[PDB]
Design a protein around this ligand. Structure first.
Ligand SMILES: NC[C@@H]1O[C@H](O[C@H]2[C@@H](O)[C@H](O[C@@H]3[C@@H](O)[C@H](N)C[C@H](N)[C@H]3O[C@H]3O[C@H](CO)[C@@H](O)[C@H](O)[C@H]3N)O[C@@H]2CO)[C@H](N)[C@@H](O)[C@@H]1O
Ligand SMILES: NC[C@@H]1O[C@H](O[C@H]2[C@@H](O)[C@H](O[C@@H]3[C@@H](O)[C@H](N)C[C@H](N)[C@H]3O[C@H]3O[C@H](CO)[C@@H](O)[C@H](O)[C@H]3N)O[C@@H]2CO)[C@H](N)[C@@H](O)[C@@H]1O
Ligand SMILES: NC[C@@H]1O[C@H](O[C@H]2[C@@H](O)[C@H](O[C@@H]3[C@@H](O)[C@H](N)C[C@H](N)[C@H]3O[C@H]3O[C@H](CO)[C@@H](O)[C@H](O)[C@H]3N)O[C@@H]2CO)[C@H](N)[C@@H](O)[C@@H]1O
Ligand SMILES: NC[C@@H]1O[C@H](O[C@H]2[C@@H](O)[C@H](O[C@@H]3[C@@H](O)[C@H](N)C[C@H](N)[C@H]3O[C@H]3O[C@H](CO)[C@@H](O)[C@H](O)[C@H]3N)O[C@@H]2CO)[C@H](N)[C@@H](O)[C@@H]1O
Ligand SMILES: NC[C@@H]1O[C@H](O[C@H]2[C@@H](O)[C@H](O[C@@H]3[C@@H](O)[C@H](N)C[C@H](N)[C@H]3O[C@H]3O[C@H](CO)[C@@H](O)[C@H](O)[C@H]3N)O[C@@H]2CO)[C@H](N)[C@@H](O)[C@@H]1O
Ligand SMILES: NC[C@@H]1O[C@H](O[C@H]2[C@@H](O)[C@H](O[C@@H]3[C@@H](O)[C@H](N)C[C@H](N)[C@H]3O[C@H]3O[C@H](CO)[C@@H](O)[C@H](O)[C@H]3N)O[C@@H]2CO)[C@H](N)[C@@H](O)[C@@H]1O
Ligand SMILES: NC[C@@H]1O[C@H](O[C@H]2[C@@H](O)[C@H](O[C@@H]3[C@@H](O)[C@H](N)C[C@H](N)[C@H]3O[C@H]3O[C@H](CO)[C@@H](O)[C@H](O)[C@H]3N)O[C@@H]2CO)[C@H](N)[C@@H](O)[C@@H]1O
Ligand SMILES: NC[C@@H]1O[C@H](O[C@H]2[C@@H](O)[C@H](O[C@@H]3[C@@H](O)[C@H](N)C[C@H](N)[C@H]3O[C@H]3O[C@H](CO)[C@@H](O)[C@H](O)[C@H]3N)O[C@@H]2CO)[C@H](N)[C@@H](O)[C@@H]1O
Ligand SMILES: NC[C@@H]1O[C@H](O[C@H]2[C@@H](O)[C@H](O[C@@H]3[C@@H](O)[C@H](N)C[C@H](N)[C@H]3O[C@H]3O[C@H](CO)[C@@H](O)[C@H](O)[C@H]3N)O[C@@H]2CO)[C@H](N)[C@@H](O)[C@@H]1O
Ligand SMILES: NC[C@@H]1O[C@H](O[C@H]2[C@@H](O)[C@H](O[C@@H]3[C@@H](O)[C@H](N)C[C@H](N)[C@H]3O[C@H]3O[C@H](CO)[C@@H](O)[C@H](O)[C@H]3N)O[C@@H]2CO)[C@H](N)[C@@H](O)[C@@H]1O
Ligand SMILES: [Mg+2]
Ligand SMILES: [Mg+2]
Ligand SMILES: [Mg+2]
Ligand SMILES: [Mg+2]
Ligand SMILES: [Mg+2]
Ligand SMILES: [Mg+2]
Ligand SMILES: [Mg+2]
Ligand SMILES: [Mg+2]
Ligand SMILES: [Mg+2]
Ligand SMILES: [Mg+2]
Ligand SMILES: [Mg+2]
Ligand SMILES: [Mg+2]
Ligand SMILES: [Mg+2]
Ligand SMILES: [Mg+2]
Ligand SMILES: [Mg+2]
Ligand SMILES: [Mg+2]
Ligand SMILES: [Mg+2]
Ligand SMILES: [Mg+2]
Ligand SMILES: [Mg+2]
Ligand SMILES: [Mg+2]
Ligand SMILES: [Mg+2]
Ligand SMILES: [Mg+2]
Ligand SMILES: [Mg+2]
Ligand SMILES: [Mg+2]
Ligand SMILES: [Mg+2]
Ligand SMILES: [Mg+2]
Ligand SMILES: [Mg+2]
Ligand SMILES: [Mg+2]
Ligand SMILES: [Mg+2]
Ligand SMILES: [Mg+2]
Ligand SMILES: [Mg+2]
Ligand SMILES: [Mg+2]
Ligand SMILES: [Mg+2]
Ligand SMILES: [Mg+2]
Ligand SMILES: [Mg+2]
Ligand SMILES: [Mg+2]
Ligand SMILES: [Mg+2]
Ligand SMILES: [Mg+2]
Ligand SMILES: [Mg+2]
Ligand SMILES: [Mg+2]
Ligand SMILES: [Mg+2]
Ligand SMILES: [Mg+2]
Ligand SMILES: [Mg+2]
Ligand SMILES: [Mg+2]
Ligand SMILES: [Mg+2]
Ligand SMILES: [Mg+2]
Ligand SMILES: [Mg+2]
Ligand SMILES: [Mg+2]
Ligand SMILES: [Mg+2]
Ligand SMILES: [Mg+2]
Ligand SMILES: [Mg+2]
Ligand SMILES: [Mg+2]
Ligand SMILES: [Mg+2]
Ligand SMILES: [Mg+2]
Ligand SMILES: [Mg+2]
Ligand SMILES: [Mg+2]
Ligand SMILES: [Mg+2]
Ligand SMILES: [Mg+2]
Ligand SMILES: [Mg+2]
Ligand SMILES: [Mg+2]
Ligand SMILES: [Mg+2]
Ligand SMILES: [Mg+2]
Ligand SMILES: [Mg+2]
Ligand SMILES: [Mg+2]
Ligand SMILES: [Mg+2]
Ligand SMILES: [Mg+2]
Ligand SMILES: [Mg+2]
Ligand SMILES: [Mg+2]
Ligand SMILES: [Mg+2]
Ligand SMILES: [Mg+2]
Ligand SMILES: [Mg+2]
Ligand SMILES: [Mg+2]
Ligand SMILES: [Mg+2]
Ligand SMILES: [Zn+2]
Ligand SMILES: [Zn+2]
Lengths: 112, 77, 63, 249, 50, 91
RNA sequence: AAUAGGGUGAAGCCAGAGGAAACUCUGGUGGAGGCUCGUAGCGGUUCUGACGUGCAAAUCGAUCGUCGAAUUUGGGUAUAGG
RNA sequence: AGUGGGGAAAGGUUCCAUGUCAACAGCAGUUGGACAUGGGUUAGUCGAUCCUAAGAGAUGGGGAAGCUCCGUUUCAACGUGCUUGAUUUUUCAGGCCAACCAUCGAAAGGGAAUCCGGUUAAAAUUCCGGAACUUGGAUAUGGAUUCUUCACGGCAACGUAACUGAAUGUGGAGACGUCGGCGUGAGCCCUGGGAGGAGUUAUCUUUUCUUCUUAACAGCUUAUCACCCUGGAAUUGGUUUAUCCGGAGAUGGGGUCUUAUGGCUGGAAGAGCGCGGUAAUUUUGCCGCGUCCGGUGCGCUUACGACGGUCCUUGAAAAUCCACAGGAAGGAAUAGUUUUCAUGCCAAGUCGUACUCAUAACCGCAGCAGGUCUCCAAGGUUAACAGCCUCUAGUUGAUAGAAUAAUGUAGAUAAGGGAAGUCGGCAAAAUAGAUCCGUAACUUCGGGAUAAGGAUUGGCUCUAAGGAUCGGUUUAACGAUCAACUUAGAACUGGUACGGACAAGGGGAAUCUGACUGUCUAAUUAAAACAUAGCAUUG
């Protein structure tokens, strides 16, 4: 079987010197240098992978359109759907309870 | 190279201001179960991309050939 | 010509074996092969209605 | 003779601490107006392992009172502190596990950790896993508090000095044997170059005061004066006593 | 190595140019005493120092 | 079947290190690899990360604990002492 | 950055049996370990072998220790003559 | 696991062509890594350059007689700051910030972007041909959007060609250890039909070997995991090789998303490959045909995916890019906005690039049996990348001829005895793979153990056992098709041979000693020495 060589001066199996083996239109077998696999965008609240956002190596995000980098919602590309839902409910319940705690201490500023 | 499928889209593209030349390639093929048919590929070379239109009908190809702008240089292969 | 001889069973006697029983045919592979056969049939019977989900669950743990 | 292993450590060439993997310095907040007069609330985001430390560390986010920003502090995690817990720090903070209070605000018998030697030094005492400081009593006229340290020593600190309510997490680590040289190797791989240790009696007289002899033996008393000089202080330095510890101390 | 600096490669160009034989018309000058280049260097025998 | 009469998890250590060292190891190594009840979600899904760090797989709550158990006896006592001193101080 | 192919079979898990209970037994599964046979690697026991104006200012041959970790190793970097 | 094909370090012209034999190639020499003359290394995409690592190191300062030492934001008034509307008044008006911020330090870390065919005597991811990509800059057309000004749809996960967003703030990516099995892909290996070419052909062989390939890039499509809607569960169900999940919503039904991977197509047959017919000293060709359709798997290598274990060990940083929160400012109707949608225009400087990488291009004084980091990896036998034979590729190099005394060096064999030799079983011999049976004292219960001790093993012809995919009132308990080598047994057979070469434990009973794994006297000592966990004392 035919054997391959590195295409660059780096002779070592490092993380950035990974190769694939590809068959050419000439019926030959050469090494083709691969780029590092992209990592998934992750949630800032729960750490889960965000759905609907392309997984690319960071510089490749600047030259691609916005629909790939976001979701049509609050905190679209930053927080997951479930984490925004808890934020909304928590914000609402907590702001509502602040009113109960306020009125209760105006009622005690006239009876105590 | 990008492929174009709609013939109407292809002729308007062939009159874009950056189109230098065109290639018409004829491939002799066979309809699998059927018999020999002559495929024709129209290739328009633009500034960024090469655009290919595949026309499997040998007669609509001839009509398309007379539908291209006369100014484009066409190479027959 | 050997491959037909070995497919017919030739050259496989005790005097022709150098690896252990488990290197030649791992018991972990045989177990995995068997338990996938049993699991595949049980889902076929339950999904065809030949057995119900209660007999299925008991036999799944027995397999 | 030669410079002995005691003396080569001060130069700190191969004897510096291995700190690549450390997760930050564990400190209390800088004592500010909010902690001096009231309390401030932060939320625990992480409880993480710090290499070279038996105690886990907690990352606690507070709001900055003066500019729009989040401030992340590295506290020593007390046992029972959980992710998402609200931590209250200040004079008016309540007596709950994990809260940071002045020493005068804690009643007698309060178990507190990461205690300040001096008001605002951000934690000096009782920082290792399973250790803590017990508050024995108060002297309100001079504003001072007496506490008992993990070594058993009693100390008097300003009552304005702060501490963290609870016991430092990760205790009981010493209860399990290491069982292997490799375990100590991995232990010190992220601490410093102090292992393994060659016995001075197994060296030559150039290398150590214990070196030499046609048998391995020290030859003179191994209790060394406190006033001895560098190169001599190898053994039991300023030893008040020797031998098996019998009875109470 | 194949990967070399400019400062190195410039020294190697001078080392090649200094490794000529003596030009033969020099022996014809009057009161000429130089018969050959006495500062020859072979790559395997004597090393440069770069 | 029952594979070992008494070594249990320390059967990975063979005959080395001494029986005394191995049985003392067994107690704390059973404790550090166990699953504990989550005080937040109620499942028995709390396991140790590094020493002193105990995470729950279900609700993703991390709690600071002991080296080999989620709670040491000393910490549990301090909570009740703190609970007690908090009640009198707050009346 | 590197480390063939085998052996053993620790926790956890499944099924069955016995027992009043506390529990025990059996058959599997699983794949632990500064575990093991053994290449490469790393090392260097014996022949007190060869050689001993040598291939070699330390090698050669067989034999041998270890071979998943306190492992082997490149480069960068730190420590300098009492 | 090469005497193959490349590289890093190091060398420096050794590379290629021509000539050539005085010296060198420990014989020779018409030959050479020698000698002489010329030629040769082409980059926006490959590395440097940028980033930071351990560390190095200026500055304000503080020491020091001083050479200098310390310190790295340090008891410092630390921006050669930016962003706009501009102004054409080359002045300004101001608006924001300045925790941290000199710098050097990686051709293996991080990192914007290129592929195929062809081409030289010698260069090529650099040249030619074709087809792309990134960054920076400029910029028009189309599209999009607005009279409900800064878009619509979907219950939702989210979808869309686009579809304002200052200061300031928050996240993500960059970004990472190790082991185990499972699954999937790719390349390789194996193999069928068919279309070509070569070899054998006394005889047999529908035979043996060989060609049948498809790059970067673009479009459409393709998913485990995760998530959404519905629904409400014991007769508990679902489920992995490996036991975990579910009233904190399972099973069931229907959907959303993510790189990876496959498919179709463009690139692209025009290329390359295999044949047939020709032109001709002939630069170089010209013509015609084919290049198609499959199968298989505990296979090998490697990538990815979903998982499980592990640690008193929890397994870099920074440059850089994106998103979100926020709501400053600016925005239409006779017209307004935006270059995150498509298309179009311009540019990408500097240095390295030949060749050797070793039993002859490096270091060991040398063309030295030594040393020196790494990538790819065919067939048979086999557990095996071992050993042995072979394909591709590469070598056939080592002064040679004639003889074959003693004594050697390396290697074989030996009657009967079997350690009597000797300090001593030194050396050699014996054992050796695999299946089945069987296995003691002692023990920290884990071991000891391959303990010991026995049997078997070839070839051939058979027998039996173990699956996959489809097809429907639950006798599918069956049919159809397809498919891998594993295990057990029998008969026959032979100069009783058979792990037939290769490969490959001798075993047992004890004493002294160190617990163990581990470590050292490079170049006479590997040990009982050192270390170690454990124990104890001291500050
Ligand atoms: N050409 C295939 C794929 O097409 C992509 O093109 C798509 C992307 O530009 C964008 O894709 C969207 C995107 O908004 C975001 N990633 C989410 C969404 N799921 C994707 O969706 C798209 O891809 C899926 C998958 O094939 C299709 O089934 C679907 O029809 C299509 N809308 O919209 C395009 C429509 O297909 C990539 N440009 C290309 O690199 C990739 O190969
Ligand atoms: N009471 C003061 C205590 O100092 C303690 O520690 C102090 C010191 O022991 C410690 O030493 C630091 C050293 O780490 C780091 N290199 C910074 C500093 N130069 C040293 O400080 C030292 O040197 C200074 C001279 O500079 C002298 O005052 C003294 O020798 C000593 N404080 O740094 C601290 C001060 O910088 C604790 N931080 C805390 O208990 C408290 O602040
Ligand atoms: N890095 C400076 C810090 O401050 C101190 O540093 C010490 C030094 O600055 C200085 O110590 C000197 C030392 O310079 C010198 N080279 C050796 C001398 N033995 C030390 O002296 C010290 O120890 C001795 C012995 O117990 C006492 O008798 C003496 O009082 C004490 N000053 O004084 C300090 C001790 O008093 C702390 N030891 C320690 O936190 C750290 O070194
Ligand atoms: N001179 C006698 C023989 O040569 C040997 O020399 C060693 C090497 O020079 C020789 O080459 C090895 C081998 O794996 C193979 N045949 C080629 C491979 N490139 C080399 O492998 C290795 O070489 C050196 C030295 O071992 C290593 O340090 C390095 O990591 C690695 N490249 O293999 C030997 C080791 O197996 C030894 N001196 C001796 O043990 C052996 O019997
Ligand atoms: N919500 C969690 C986040 O955790 C953050 O804390 C972490 C981050 O600041 C930083 O984490 C980095 C991250 O910044 C960066 N974008 C890369 C990666 N996502 C993280 O990586 C972290 O976790 C991975 C897990 O395998 C480890 O390999 C890595 O060593 C570790 N730093 O290191 C911290 C410790 O892991 C912050 N507290 C905050 O952003 C937020 O709370
Ligand atoms: N331009 C940047 C690059 O874009 C790439 O984009 C690739 C993807 O968008 C898309 O890849 C598709 C993939 O979506 C789909 N699920 C499978 C399909 N086979 C792939 O196709 C691609 O990759 C395969 C190899 O797997 C090639 O054989 C094929 O020629 C190529 N078009 O086609 C593009 C081919 O370049 C990659 N994301 C990555 O290499 C990188 O980001
Ligand atoms: N494939 C499974 C999935 O993919 C991921 O998992 C991938 C890896 O992260 C994971 O690796 C192992 C894991 O198996 C094991 N049970 C725990 C272990 N800590 C992980 O290791 C990890 O730790 C380091 C920390 O520095 C990470 O940086 C790194 O991602 C990974 N090596 O194994 C997977 C390899 O295919 C995610 N962890 C998660 O979504 C899920 O497990
Ligand atoms: N542009 C060439 C690049 O810079 C350098 O080349 C430049 C220098 O050699 C030289 O620069 C001189 C400078 O030496 C001298 N001391 C001052 C003079 N003004 C410079 O001149 C140059 O630089 C100025 C800016 O300073 C430019 O405005 C001007 O256009 C340019 N000629 O002029 C060259 C043109 O820029 C490198 N030598 C070259 O290899 C590299 O490609
Ligand atoms: N059984 C293992 C095999 O033994 C083989 O070896 C066999 C023969 O080579 C070996 O012969 C050896 C001889 O080589 C060696 N130099 C000396 C010895 N006297 C001979 O031994 C033989 O003769 C003696 C006569 O008394 C008898 O015991 C018997 O016939 C036999 N062992 O006897 C062995 C059989 O007993 C091979 N080494 C190899 O294939 C494999 O190891
Ligand atoms: N499992 C052992 C099996 O034995 C087989 O053969 C064995 C038997 O089948 C056979 O024995 C047969 C016996 O069955 C039958 N009743 C009588 C016959 N004479 C024997 O055979 C014998 O004699 C014949 C000549 O007749 C010779 O081939 C030879 O001496 C011997 N095989 O000979 C072997 C005696 O044990 C194969 N040899 C072997 O490959 C296979 O593994
Ligand atoms: Mg890796
Ligand atoms: Mg095209
Ligand atoms: Mg058989
Ligand atoms: Mg098993
Ligand atoms: Mg010691
Ligand atoms: Mg000694
Ligand atoms: Mg002395
Ligand atoms: Mg003395
Ligand atoms: Mg002595
Ligand atoms: Mg001695
Ligand atoms: Mg002693
Ligand atoms: Mg005496
Ligand atoms: Mg006592
Ligand atoms: Mg040399
Ligand atoms: Mg010199
Ligand atoms: Mg193994
Ligand atoms: Mg071992
Ligand atoms: Mg071993
Ligand atoms: Mg070793
Ligand atoms: Mg030797
Ligand atoms: Mg000798
Ligand atoms: Mg001699
Ligand atoms: Mg060996
Ligand atoms: Mg080094
Ligand atoms: Mg001296
Ligand atoms: Mg081999
Ligand atoms: Mg030459
Ligand atoms: Mg000669
Ligand atoms: Mg001669
Ligand atoms: Mg020359
Ligand atoms: Mg690049
Ligand atoms: Mg530059
Ligand atoms: Mg630094
Ligand atoms: Mg300095
Ligand atoms: Mg100065
Ligand atoms: Mg500098
Ligand atoms: Mg730099
Ligand atoms: Mg440097
Ligand atoms: Mg680099
Ligand atoms: Mg061509
Ligand atoms: Mg080419
Ligand atoms: Mg070449
Ligand atoms: Mg080109
Ligand atoms: Mg729209
Ligand atoms: Mg990294
Ligand atoms: Mg692995
Ligand atoms: Mg794996
Ligand atoms: Mg695979
Ligand atoms: Mg590419
Ligand atoms: Mg895949
Ligand atoms: Mg926003
Ligand atoms: Mg080259
Ligand atoms: Mg040599
Ligand atoms: Mg060799
Ligand atoms: Mg020299
Ligand atoms: Mg010779
Ligand atoms: Mg001769
Ligand atoms: Mg012989
Ligand atoms: Mg005899
Ligand atoms: Mg006889
Ligand atoms: Mg006898
Ligand atoms: Mg005798
Ligand atoms: Mg012997
Ligand atoms: Mg046996
Ligand atoms: Mg024994
Ligand atoms: Mg004795
Ligand atoms: Mg020992
Ligand atoms: Mg003892
Ligand atoms: Mg020695
Ligand atoms: Mg030894
Ligand atoms: Mg020795
Ligand atoms: Mg010792
Ligand atoms: Mg004490
Ligand atoms: Zn979330
Ligand atoms: Zn929980």
């Amino acid at each position: 079987a035919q054997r391959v060589t590195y295409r660059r001066r780096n002779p070592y199996n490092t993380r950035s010197n990974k190769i694939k083996v590809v068959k050419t239109p000439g019926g030959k077998l050469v090494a083709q240098h691969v780029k590092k696999a992209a990592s998934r965008v992750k949630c800032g609240d729960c750490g889960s992978a965000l759905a609907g956002i392309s997984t690319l190596r960071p510089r490749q995000y600047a030259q691609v359109s916005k629909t790939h980098k976001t979701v049509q919602r609050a905190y679209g590309g930053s927080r997951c759907a479930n984490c925004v839902k808890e934020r909304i409910v928590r914000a609402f319940l907590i702001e509502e309870q602040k009113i109960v705690k306020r009125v209760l201490k105006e009622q005690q500023d006239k009876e105590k | 190279a990008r492929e174009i499928k709609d013939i109407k889209e292809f002729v308007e593209l062939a009159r874009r201001s950056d189109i230098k030349s065109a290639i018409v390639k004829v491939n002799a093929k066979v309809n699998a179960n059927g018999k020999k048919f002559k495929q024709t590929k129209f290739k328009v070379r633009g500034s960024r991309y090469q655009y290919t239109l595949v026309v499997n009908d040998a007669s609509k190809a001839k009509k398309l050939q007379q539908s291209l702008p006369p100014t484009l240089k066409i190479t027959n292969l | 010509a050997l491959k037909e001889s070995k497919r017919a069973g030739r050259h496989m006697g005790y005097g022709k074996r150098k690896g252990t029983k488990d290197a030649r045919m791992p018991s972990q592979v045989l177990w995995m092969r068997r338990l996938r056969v049993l699991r595949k049939l049980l889902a076929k019977y339950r999904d065809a209605g030949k057995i119900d989900k209660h007999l299925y669950h008991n036999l799944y743990k027995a397999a | 003779g030669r410079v002995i292993r005691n003396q080569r450590k001060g130069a700190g060439s191969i004897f510096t601490s291995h700190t690549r993997l450390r997760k930050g310095a564990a400190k209390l907040r800088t004592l500010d107006y909010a902690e001096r007069h009231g309390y401030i609330r932060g939320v625990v985001k992480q409880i993480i392992h710090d290499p070279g430390r038996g105690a886990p560390l907690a990352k606690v986010a507070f709001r900055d009172p003066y500019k729009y920003k989040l401030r992340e502090e590295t506290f020593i995690a007390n046992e029972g502190v959980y992710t998402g817990q609200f931590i209250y720090a200040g004079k008016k903070a309540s007596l709950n596990v994990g809260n940071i209070l002045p020493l005068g605000a804690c009643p007698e018998g309060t178990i507190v950790s990461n205690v300040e030697e001096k008001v605002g030094d951000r934690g000096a005492l009782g920082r290792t896993s399973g250790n803590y400081v017990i508050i024995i009593g108060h002297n309100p006229d001079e504003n001072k508090t007496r506490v008992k340290l993990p070594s058993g020593a009693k100390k008097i600190i300003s009552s304005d000095a702060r501490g963290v309510i609870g016991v430092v997490a990760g205790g009981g680590r010493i209860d399990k044997p290491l069982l292997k040289a490799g375990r100590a190797f991995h232990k010190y791989k992220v601490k410093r170059n102090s292992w393994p240790k060659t016995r001075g009696v197994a060296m030559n007289p150039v290398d150590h005061p214990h070196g030499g002899g046609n048998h391995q033996h020290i030859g003179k008393a191994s209790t060394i004066s406190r006033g001895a000089v560098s190169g001599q202080k190898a053994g039991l330095i300023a030893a008040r006593r020797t031998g098996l510890l019998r009875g109470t101390q | 190595p194949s990967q070399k600096s400019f400062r190195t490669k410039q020294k190697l160009a001078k080392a090649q140019k200094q490794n000529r034989p003596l030009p033969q018309w020099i022996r014809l000058r009057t009161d000429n005493k130089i018969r050959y280049n006495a500062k020859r260097r072979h790559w395997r025998r004597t090393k440069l120092g770069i | 079947t029952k594979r070992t009469k008494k070594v249990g998890i320390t059967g990975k250590f063979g005959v080395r290190y001494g029986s005394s060292l191995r049985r003392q190891t067994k107690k704390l190594e059973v404790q550090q690899h166990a699953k504990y009840d989550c005080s937040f979600c109620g499942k028995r899904t709390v396991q140790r990360g590094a020493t002193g760090i105990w995470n729950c797989k279900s609700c993703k709550k991390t709690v600071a604990g002991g080296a080999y158990t989620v709670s040491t006896a000393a910490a549990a006592t301090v909570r009740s002492t703190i609970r007690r001193l908090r009640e009198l101080a707050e009346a």
